[PDB]
Amino acid sequence: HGSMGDPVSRVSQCHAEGPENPKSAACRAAVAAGGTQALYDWNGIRIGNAAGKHQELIPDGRLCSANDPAFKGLDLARADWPATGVSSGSYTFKYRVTAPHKGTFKVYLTKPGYDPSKPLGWGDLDLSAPVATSTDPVASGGFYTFSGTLPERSGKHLLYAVWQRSDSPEAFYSCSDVTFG
Ligand SMILES: [Cu+2]
Ligand code: NA
């Protein structure tokens, strides 16, 4: 259980605003669409029986909720999700982990031309060249820390992190909004 901490996941960012009266238009829309409970369960975007079949199990437009209706407010195609500013180059990812598990993280970045006003699909992600991978990182202080590389990009983008357990078919999913502008 967990979610991306740096760059902060969309679910954790809405939680940090105060789920009962969010600050941003985007998080207010997420709560009107899917309720406040999702934000308290920020560490629980999961598929119990994924077994590496992410693209088979998760429809386009359902990546940020992992096709769980509880999290459907996170699927909105907003141009205005609050975003972490990033730059191309080496990057130290921090994944906020509330329950450690053996397994592998892969982090994918949207392709050039990404339009956040359209639903997120697998086709929008560069799945052939993950920006980071980490197998069995060591939890410390409530985080996994692992490095990768953000490639050259120009404007609004999204990072999609898949955490597949190795002792279990369960996986966890995180989308983080970023901008290179
Ligand atoms: Cu867990
Ligand atoms: Na975005």
Author numbering: 1 to 181
Reproduce, without paraphrasing, sentences from the article in which this PDB structure was first reported:
Bacterial lytic polysaccharide monooxygenases (LPMOs) are known to oxidize the most abundant and recalcitrant polymers in Nature, namely cellulose and chitin. The genome of the model actinomycete Streptomyces coelicolor A3(2) encodes seven putative LPMOs, of which, upon phylogenetic analysis, four group with typical chitin-oxidizing LPMOs, two with typical cellulose-active LPMOs, and one which stands out by being part of a subclade of non-characterized enzymes. The latter enzyme, called ScLPMO10D, and most of the enzymes found in this subclade are unique, not only because of variation in the catalytic domain, but also as their C-terminus contains a cell wall sorting signal (CWSS), which flags the LPMO for covalent anchoring to the cell wall. While showing several structural and functional features typical for bacterial cellulose active LPMOs, ScLPMO10D is only active on chitin.
The structure of the catalytic domain of ScLPMO10D (residues 34–214, lacking the linker and the CWSS), hereafter called ScLPMO10DCD, was determined to 1.37 Å resolution with a single molecule in the asymmetric unit using the crystal structure of LPMO10A from Tectaria macrodonta (Tma12; PDB ID: 6IF738) as the starting model. The structure shows the typical LPMO fold with a central β-sandwich built up by two distorted β-sheets that are connected by several loops and helices. The active site of ScLPMO10D is formed by His34 and His134, which coordinate the bound copper cofactor in a T-shaped geometry. No water molecules were found adjacent to the copper, which indicates that the copper had been photo-reduced during data collection. The residues in the secondary coordination sphere resemble those found in C1-oxidizing cellulose-active AA10 LPMOs, such as ScLPMO10C26 and in the atypical chitin-active CjLPMO10A44. In ScLPMO10D, an additional arginine (Arg79) is interacting with Glu203 that together with Arg198 forms a remarkable arrangement that has, to the best of our knowledge, not been observed in any other LPMO. Generally, it is worth noting the considerable variation in second sphere residues, the functional implications of which are largely unknown. It is also worth noting that the arrangement of a catalytically crucial glutamate (Glu203) interacting closely with two positively charged residues (Arg79 and Arg198) really stands out from the active site arrangements found in other LPMOs. Like CjLPMO10A44, ScLPMO10D shows a “hybrid”-type catalytic center with features known from both cellulose-active and chitin-active LPMO10s. While Arg198 and Glu203 in ScLPMO10D are common to cellulose-active LPMO10s, Asn76 and Thr131 are common to chitin-active LPMOs.
